[PDB]
């Protein structure tokens, strides 16, 4: 396990260009009934982009919320079919999990996502290999709000901010039946007080410049 090097051989990063004002919101585990819709207001309102990470299983139960997510700018990325460690799975089932997902997204969004986020952060060197080869870009994060814990508003807004730097890559979540208030809550604290340090708000693709689309 080496992601240091890994920056170097493939289409993989943890965070973004040092000398552009510019961080990336993304949200993982999407879509949902409850904490999707309420975060694409806050966005909204806040007239930022951001990234989301689509499971594919969660995609299949609610179509529309993808759609909407695509209809609003946002970019959507791969977040595999049914979040497993894919550390611990074989070659074709870690395929199969981006390519089945893959299928459902550009269905429903009308594009093939170019960026994959693996569940937990867990990649091996030949799935990075395999993705370099088909054309897309692995990013992980550089801000973990961990956010899943249930922690508020205030504890999210504090560590963003805290640990918040120029191609900075934020991780929040939208999982069913997740405990993520705090974190919808915590946008309208951290999107304006960066916004004061004179930060901007950037999509994945604009970030990394590259297409959204494989």
Same mark, same amino acid.
């Given at each position: ?34 904490? !999707?819709?309420? #975060? =694409?207001?806050? %966005?909204?309102?806040?007239?930022? /982009? ?5 499971? &594919? *299983? ?42 089945? !997902?893959?299928? #459902? =997204?550009?269905? %429903?969004?009308?594009?093939?996502? /170019? ?5 937990? &952060? *867990? ?92």
């Amino acid at each position: 396990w080496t992601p240091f090097s890994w920056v170097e051989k493939y289409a993989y990063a943890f965070s973004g260009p040092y000398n552009k004002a510019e961080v990336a919101l993304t949200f993982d585990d999407g879509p949902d009934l409850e904490f !999707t819709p309420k #975060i =694409l207001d806050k %966005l909204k309102q806040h007239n930022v /982009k951001a990234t989301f990470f689509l499971l &594919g *299983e969660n995609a299949e139960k609610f179509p529309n919320i993808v759609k909407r997510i695509a209809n609003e700018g946002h970019v959507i990325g791969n977040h595999t079919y049914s979040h497993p460690n894919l550390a611990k799975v074989n070659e074709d089932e870690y395929r199969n999990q981006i390519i089945k !997902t893959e299928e #459902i =997204l550009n269905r %429903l969004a009308g594009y093939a996502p /170019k960026f994959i986020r693996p569940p937990y &952060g *867990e990649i091996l060197e030949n799935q990075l290999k395999w993705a370099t080869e088909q054309n897309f870009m692995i990013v992980q994060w550089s801000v973990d709000t961990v956010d899943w814990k249930g922690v508020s508003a205030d504890t999210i807004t504090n560590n963003v901010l805290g640990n918040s730097f120029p191609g900075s890559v934020i991780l929040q979540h939208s999982t069913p039946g997740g405990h993520l208030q705090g974190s919808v809550d915590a946008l309208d604290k951290i999107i304006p007080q960066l916004k004061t340090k004179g930060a901007r708000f950037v999509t994945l693709p604009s970030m990394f410049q590259t297409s959204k689309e494989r």
